[PDB]
Amino acid sequence: MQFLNMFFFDIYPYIAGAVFLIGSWLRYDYGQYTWRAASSQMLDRKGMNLASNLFHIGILGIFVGYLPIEVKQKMAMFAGGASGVLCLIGGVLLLKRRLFSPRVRATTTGADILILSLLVIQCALGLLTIPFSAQHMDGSEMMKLVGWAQSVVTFHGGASQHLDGVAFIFRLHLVLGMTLFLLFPFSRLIHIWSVPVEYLTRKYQLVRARH
């Protein structure tokens, strides 16, 4: 148990992180043509408007989230609760479409099923943690998780110690979430890197000189 503990929270997070960063750079430099959102909307419009917006607006609200610590827990439980519900609905709807909408299912790749399934699971887990963090309204649970995360990103050994005695569900959520980073550069998730921010301040017409 202690061995698995150090692996998943001291070692693995760095494997997934190394694969995530160098995988993105390598696929960006050698896979430009493969770097797309892979929209499937045209093949089947039904319900995409609602589904996709629920999922994206939901998951994005959660990430903007990821004033004392216990206040943050309250906000995160109701704000993150709602967003997670919108997100889970969207995700489930997007998965039902991918698996059963003839045109979408026939032109889908495996990674699209896998990555979307793991996200729906990751979202379901996230919601399931709510009742567990509810038993520690003093934000004690949240504190441990934050401690771990900070230790990991600052490259401070012993990160898993911060997780001493935290609800098991938070363990899974962390493992699945890191796994998503590991699988990131090899799935459609790369579209996230490309969020078109510069567009808001760009001149309308673009002209490329002789090069």
């Binding site: 760009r202 001149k203 309308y204 017409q205 673009l206 002209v207 490329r208 000189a209 090069h211």
Partner: peptide, 17 residues
């Protein structure tokens, strides 16, 4: 980012092709 044109309606870029 080279010269703009049409009073800021357009931008001439010097990028790879």
């Amino acid at each position: 980012k080279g010269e703009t044109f049409a009073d800021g309606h357009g931008q001439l870029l010097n990028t790879n092709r």
